[PDB]
Structure formats: C-alpha cells, structure tokens
Design a protein around this ligand. Structure first.
Ligand SMILES: *[C@@H]1O[C@H](CO[C@@H]2O[C@@H](C)[C@@H](O)[C@@H](O)[C@@H]2O)[C@@H](O[C@@H]2O[C@H](CO)[C@@H](O)[C@H](O)[C@H]2NC(C)=O)[C@H](O)[C@H]1NC(C)=O
Ligand SMILES: [Cl-]
Lengths: 214, 192, 214, 202, 170
C-alpha cells in the first residue's frame, strides 16, 4: 500500500535537539511533495514545513514558528524524509505527521505521527492497581507515569466489548494517571477471567494484572 | 514603464489553446497586486514561488500564455497532467515555475446561437514538449488506409471545436487562462 | 500569513441531518482550499481538495462548495462514523495555514449514567496512597456534576475527572472522578461517597462505601 | 478483422476506477470505436455529449477503456469494433454490475394447478451474487432437461437478482412420486437449502 | 439528423453511407452490409440477403426472398464513423404456501415469444418480478411472473394477473 511511518519521537529537554524521520513506501518518493505537520495535544493542525519534489530540486519552505531552528531534509536512496529540530521549546511538544501530495496544493496521505515531549520532567513507569467489581464494571488504575503514552488491552487483546480507557490527567507533581474500565454481564464474573495489559514503552514498563472480585 | 498585464488579461480576443498566444513582458516594473487582489479569477495557482512575494522578486524574462478551454480542462494546465489539452495543446514543464490564472468566460466566449471559433487539437502522433506550439492542419490518419490529405473514414481533420452555448453546465463553459512563467537566466533581471 | 476562521467551532447533529461547516479566509485564495476530517488520536484524512473535488474512497455524502474567501463542507445525511474535527486548509500561499477546526458532536436521546464506586486496592494502600474511583458509564449528554463527600462533607481539591471520546456504537460518554490522597488522610475518614447529577436522573444518585467494610 | 473484448463479468460500487481491454485480430492502427450509443472513437477521441469520466488508450492491435468514478447510469455492457475495413465486425461484449454485500436467497416452491394437470415452479427471491444453482429432486431423483430457470435484470431498487426455476413433467410421472424438492446451492447459504411439498397434502 | 426504420431505413447535412446492424436474441452487435446512396454500390451475409437503396427518398433497404432487430447507421460527417443509428426493426396458476409469502401466474407453451403481463389491472407493482420467456425442450416457451405480499393479505384480498390466484386451503 501507500505507507508513511514516522520515528524518533520521545522525551527531550528544553534546549536539546531531536531529529525525526518519515519512512515512505509504495510510491515514487522523488515524484511527490512531502511536508511535516504538527499538533500539540488537544490543539489544531500546524504546518512545520515542505520539501518540493525532485523536479523542483527539493526546495524547502518553513513555518515561522520553526524557521532558523528546524531543517527539512531528504534521502531518496533510503526513501525517508527528516526533520532536525535544535533549540527546542515546551511549545514544540506535539504529534509530528508527515504528509505527501502528488500536487503541492493538498496532502493525500498522512503518517500515524511521532510524539515529541519537551519537558524538564523525568521518565517514570506506572504502578497498576485493580478496580474489583462489588451489569458489573471492573477496571485497572494506571498511576503516576511520565511521559505519555500508555496502552491498555483486556485479556491479552481478546476483550474489547464495553471497555473505556480514560484520557490521562496531569497531576501537580507532573505524573499522569488513568483507569481502564470494562462493563461485563453480571453472570460472566464467576467463569470469565479478567486481566488488563498495560504497556509504557518510554520507561520500558510492561505489566499484566489480574482483576478478581474481593 | 508600467507593465502591460492589462493587454493580456483585458484582451477582447483570446487565442485558441492549440494556437496559444505568448507575450514576452520585459523592461517594465510589474505591479502583480492587480492580480491576487481580484475576485474575477476562479484559479490562481503558483508553482515556482508565492503570489504575494512576486512583487518583491526579480526575473530575467517573464512570458504570458493566453488561451480558452473548457471548465473541466483547467486542471490539465498544471505540472504533471495527461489529457487532450496537456498532451496535444499546452504542456507545462515538470519543474514549472509560475502562476496558472484562469476565469469563467461564459459572458464573452459563449454565443446564444453557439460559438465554434474556439478549437483544440483532438489527435497527435506524439505528446507536445513543454511550451511547444503546433498549428498543423494535416489530416490525422488512424486507419490502415493512408489519406492523401483527403479527410474521410479514419482521416480526421485534427482540430475540433468547443460547443460554447452559455447555458452549458460550468464544466463545459468557456474559461480564459493566463500562464505567467518566470525565467532566472544567467543575464541581468529586467523585470521585478 | 492567511488566517482561516471555521464556523461553527463546535456543532451538535442528529444522525441523517444535513450539516454545514464554513471556512472563511483573511484574503482571496480562489479555489485553493482543502478539507480534512480528524477522528481523535488518528491522522487526518483528506476529504476534498481544490474547493470541490471529493477524494477517491471518501463517501459521497461529503461535498465542497465555495470560492474567493468563503468555503463550506457539507455532510448530507450525516451517518455513523462521523464524530471528528473537520479542518479547512489553504495552499494558495506559504505559509501553509489551517483553520481552528470545528468539533462536530452527534445529538442523541437522554441516557442516564450507570454509577459504580471502587475503594482503593489493598495493594495501593501498602504503597502509601489511596485512590477512590467513581465511574459514570454510558450517558448522554456529556454535561454531568460529580461531588465527592467524605464523612458527609463536600471534599475539594483532591479529585481529577476525565471524559472519554463519544463512542461510535451508541454516541454515549463515560466519565471518571478519582479522589487521590495520602493513606494517613484516607484513614482519618469513614464514609466516602460519589454524588452524581444529570438530565437522565430524576434525582442525584450517590454510591458509597464505609472504609474497611466489603 | 475479428474482435476480442474482455472480461464479460465486472462487479463494482459507484465511483470506482474501471479498466476494460479489447484485442484486435489484425492491426487496424487506431480505427477502434467503443459503444455502450457511440462513446469513444479512434482509441481515445470522445463523442460529443459523452461525460469526460470515460477515457480509452490504445494503438495497432491493443486498446483499453477507463471510467473515473462509476455513476449509477454507467452500469451496462460495452462492445468495441474496427472501422479499418469492411465488414465493420463489432466485438464479443462486456457487462458491469453493482457490488452489494452477500444476500442469501428466500426459496419458495409453488405446486401445480388442477388446470395444468404438470409444472412445479421454484423461486429464489432478492439475492446477490448472480451465481446460484437450482437442483430439482422428485422422490430423491435428480431431474435433467425437463427443468428451465430464468433470471431478472439487476433490480432497479436494491440491485439484487431473482431466479425462477420451472420443472416440467408428464401428469402420470408426477403422480408416480410424492416428493417435490428444490435444493438451492448459493453463496448466501452455508450449505444447500431444500424447499419441498407433497402431492395430495396441504 | 436521425434515421427512422419501418423492411427499410430512411433519415434526414444528410448521411453519405448506410450500413445494417442486426441483433439476435441475447447477442452482440452484428454488421449486415453497406450501400452508399449516392454511389448506390459482409462475406458471411453475402447471398443470405439483398442490400438495395433509393437516394430520391434518402432510403436504404434490407430485403430477402428466403428473428431479430434491424439497425441502419449513417454519418452526420465524412470524418466521424458510427455516429447516429435508427431506432431498430424487430422481425421474428401458482398459489401462496399455506411475514412474507409469494404467489404468481405461470404462462406456458407460447410462441412467438414475447409475453407481457401486469397485476390486478396495473394497480399492484410492489414486490413484482416478471421473468424473461424461455424456449423449452418442446421448442415452445414457459414463463412465470411472481409477487411477495404480506402474509396478512393472504386469506383476505384476492389477486388477478386473467387468473384468480388464492390459497387452495384444503
Ligand atoms: C484589467 O481590468 C481590470 C478590470 O478593469 C476595469 O473594468 C473595465 C470594464 C474597464 O472599465 C477598466 O477601465 C476598469 O479598470 C482592472 O482592474 C481594475 O482597475 C481599476 C483601475 O483602473 C480599478 O478601479 C478596479 O477596481 C479594478 N478592478 C475591477 C474594476 O474589477 C485591471 O487593472 C486591468 N488590468 C490588469 C488585469 O492588470
Ligand atoms: Cl440521533
């Protein structure tokens, strides 16, 4: 298929440099225009910059927010696009999508994006507590992790019906917390086995926790 | 002097696409504010450069290409298009640096009875090279029988005419096009 | 730079209704204006380019009109799978600016929230904090009030609430209120209760436990 | 010169890109018409009043046909030809049909009237795809020749098909057995479905 | 310009050639032959038919001495082939099971096909599927037309396709 996959995102200190890569499959990378577009969490779409296609050299435009500190670059051999960010700010925190157009006037395909988090704060894995059932709701508390993100599955991917994973909240401390909850039929609690699967890649923390009635 | 964009845009007469006009704008100062500050235009797409910055940029030569085409043909006047118009009439280079400006011409180029004074090349035995023009009226042969310049079965006159009655849907209606092209040749820039 | 103002920012729509979002521009951008839909935590998808052209694969209930400075997207018979932010985008000039977005929410019949409270895990307690989770599951509309009451007094400033995104099964929300406090402080009070207010509920619902007692 | 044209079978929803290829018995350069009404002539040229959705590319003994986004009205079968030399022999044929989710068929068995006595008719109503086999079984005995099935043009409303078996028997042969079964083999059913009646019952 | 067919073809810039297109049941386009009216001048139809003309009436003809539609095609222009044609010339009791049942009318042993029917004097058209006629082992044909109806209507309303179709109801 058409595939754009971004990489390099993670935790970086104010004033430190990071560089992200956009790896492009299923089309003539040289032919297409490729741009970076960012989105700080719960805000709108912000254009970072452009590289034109091989026919137009590979000529570049930047948004003023990143001009002078960010650099867009191309490697046609490796079929990948690059953003080199240097004197980073808290405001550079965002998801970085790369977008390609076969025309310079719109973006057909977009990547899933790489999350860059720009804080002084420091990495810590979560702790995982069970929310035992007294339909019957049960869940997991994922407490005190930085930075975003964390993923939660039920019974090693199996269980997806009536499951809610709440957006993380930021404590005064600078850690994140969320719960995931499942609405289950009353009778199934005795026979069906309930386990939440919590993965925090940034700290390299994986936890599988069994939830049973007290 | 003040730079003769009026002539090109406000021309009573427009060339047919196959016979497209080209004018060399030179030893002039070019306002350009006059273009993007207009509502007449349906399309104002710039590839090299930026419409708003053109008045703060300087160039060796600029050319204005004028013609008329159907509404649903305007998207062919762009880098990287295939189609009758891009193939056999007007072709932009892959590395095109300039602005395609077009606008609906129903008022002027559509006759209540019908205007057929506007023609396009229907057939050619190879695609045009960028910025190439071809006025041939040589009978095009797609039959096994070679025509001796005598039109008939598989012996079509290559130019065809537009139906431009003014109540045609906007796709089939006439639009005037002006393609401005900016060349940075080795020589001194004579138009900013 | 060219500013683009969408109208309306937020918009509520019944299934099958005919919704219209308008993008307006600080200057003439002729037909250089694209529309994207962004479903939460996913890359935007291109609906429409160059005012009026619908992308291959896009459903034909999506339509672009407009010229000069005023454009509008149209969902005729807005169906399921349509909760997203809708973004207009101009390509006329650099820089490549976007509109602020418009969040479209689906209308629905009132649905009262099922309420569950969960005492802290014994596990978490031995770490030395207690987190009391309160879950308001599958209700509409979003608006809801959650008051914590500890030993029958209003508790303030030890509680974070989180809302899930609208669920494309049934167009309902889930909410969490989490009272987090020192184990010491947790053991100074006996009655923890979660008091819930909503359109759906004839009178406020309270769920509680006495600390220690199953 | 003798024409090819492939395929006879195409299933697609509205708006889909469509590609069809018509082969040439001897090189006619580009003297190829495309009909639905004349659509495309001389390989790529478009007949006035035909939508620009349609496009064709070909030369010598090889050609194709393209439709950008299938409109409802474009559903039909298209035939090429040669304008090279007399006689102007047309192509074989090619037909395009709407893609809708697998629909299992409703099977109904009408028994024969005193009036006819013997014709026992089977019905498969409102189904997709077109493919469905209708076996007749008179007292476990499979019947061959005596049967005659006839299908609808794709329904104007819900674009489903409907099929009409009609088993024909001598009155005495009819009276010889009790069973009148109609076993239906179709994508819409997991395994074959029988509809049956018994003479001199209700 | 247009061409109006009857077995002859006439029409009225007036066309400079007239050929012949025949259509056997469930078949593709078949070219008959040519005769240019001015000049008045297929190896598989050659001596199967005779192809004549009359310029005066702008008439072209297809004649026999020994089953289908006959289409004559001409040109509005000398350039453009196969442009406009003619309109063509054509020369050639089930009872519901005892919340949806089905009932119909079996039309059998008929020639020459075609069979056209309607339901309750054209008043009922919601559920109706009228199948194409078939040529049977006999060389004649058998055609059946049906209709789904609410099981409610069964045993209340009557149906006339003219054949009186109802439950046998022993
Ligand atoms: C090309 O013409 C536009 C339109 O010109 C005006 O209307 C014509 C009928 C004729 O009366 C002209 O004299 C008019 O100028 C020009 O844009 C206009 O410029 C005038 C200043 O001369 C200004 O008053 C108008 O507001 C402008 N726009 C309008 C009326 O729409 C343009 O200058 C001409 N030359 C080009 C294209 O550069
Ligand atoms: Cl609703």
């Amino acid at each position: 298929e058409v595939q754009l996959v971004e990489s390099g995102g993670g935790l970086v200190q104010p004033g430190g440099s990071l560089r992200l890569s956009c790896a492009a499959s299923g089309f003539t990378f040289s032919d297409h225009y490729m741009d970076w577009v960012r989105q700080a969490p719960g805000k709108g779409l912000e254009w970072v910059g452009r590289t034109r296609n091989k026919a137009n050299s590979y000529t570049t435009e930047y948004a003023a927010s990143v001009k002078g500190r960010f650099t867009i670059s191309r490697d046609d051999s490796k079929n990948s696009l690059y953003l080199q960010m240097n004197s980073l700010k808290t405001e550079d925190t965002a998801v970085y999508y790369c977008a390609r157009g076969i025309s310079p006037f719109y973006f057909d395909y977009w990547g899933q994006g790489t999350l860059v988090t720009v804080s002084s704060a420091s990495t810590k894995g979560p702790s995982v507590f069970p929310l035992a059932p007294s339909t019957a709701a049960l869940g997991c508390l994922v407490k005190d992790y930085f930075p975003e993100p964390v993923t939660v599955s039920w019974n090693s991917g199996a269980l997806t019906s009536g499951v809610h994973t709440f957006p993380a909240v930021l404590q005064s401390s600078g850690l994140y917390s969320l719960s995931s909850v499942v609405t289950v039929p009353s009778s199934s609690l005795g026979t069906q086995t309930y386990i939440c699967n919590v993965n925090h890649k940034p700290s390299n923390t994986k936890v599988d926790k069994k939830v049973e009635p007290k | 002097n003040l730079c003769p964009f009026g002539e090109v845009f406000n021309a009573t007469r427009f060339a047919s696409v196959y016979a497209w006009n080209r004018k060399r704008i030179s030893n002039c100062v070019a306002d350009y504010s006059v273009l993007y500050n207009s509502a007449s235009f349906s399309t104002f797409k710039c590839y090299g450069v930026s419409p708003t910055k053109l008045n703060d940029l300087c160039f060796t030569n600029v050319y204005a290409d004028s013609f008329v085409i159907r509404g649903d043909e305007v998207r062919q006047i762009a880098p990287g298009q295939t189609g009758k118009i891009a193939d056999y009439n007007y072709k932009l280079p892959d590395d095109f640096t300039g602005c395609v400006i077009a606008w609906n011409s129903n008022n002027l180029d559509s006759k209540v009875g019908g205007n057929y004074n506007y023609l396009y090349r229907l057939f050619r035995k190879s695609n045009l090279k960028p910025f190439e023009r071809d006025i041939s009226t040589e009978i095009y042969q797609a039959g096994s029988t070679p025509c001796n310049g005598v039109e008939g079965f598989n012996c079509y006159f290559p130019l065809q005419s537009y139906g431009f009655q003014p109540t045609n849907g906007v796709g089939y209606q006439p639009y005037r096009v002006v393609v401005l092209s900016f060349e940075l040749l080795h020589a001194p820039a004579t138009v900013c | 730079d060219i500013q683009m103002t969408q109208s309306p920012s937020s918009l509520s729509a019944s299934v099958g209704d005919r919704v219209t979002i308008t993008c307006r521009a600080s200057q003439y951008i002729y037909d250089s204006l694209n529309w994207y839909q962004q479903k939460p935590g996913k890359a935007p998808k291109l609906l429409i380019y160059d005012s009026s052209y619908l992308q291959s694969g896009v459903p034909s209930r999506f339509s672009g009109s407009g010229s000069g400075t005023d454009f509008t997207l149209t969902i005729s018979s807005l169906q399921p799978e349509d909760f997203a932010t809708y973004y207009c985008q101009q390509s006329w000039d650099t820089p490549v600016t976007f509109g602020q977005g418009t969040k479209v929410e689906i209308k629905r019949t009132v649905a009262a929230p099922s309420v569950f409270i969960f005492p802290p895990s014994d596990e978490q307690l031995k770490s030395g904090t207690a987190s009391v989770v309160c879950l308001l599951n599958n209700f509409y509309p979003r608006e809801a009030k959650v008051q914590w009451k500890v030993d029958n007094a209003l508790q303030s400033g030890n509680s974070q609430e989180s809302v899930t995104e609208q669920d494309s099964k049934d167009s309902t929300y889930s909410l969490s209120s989490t009272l987090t406090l020192s184990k010491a402080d947790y053991e100074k009070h006996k009655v923890y209760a979660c008091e819930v207010t909503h359109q759906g509920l004839s009178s406020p619902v309270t769920k509680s436990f006495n600390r220690g007692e199953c």
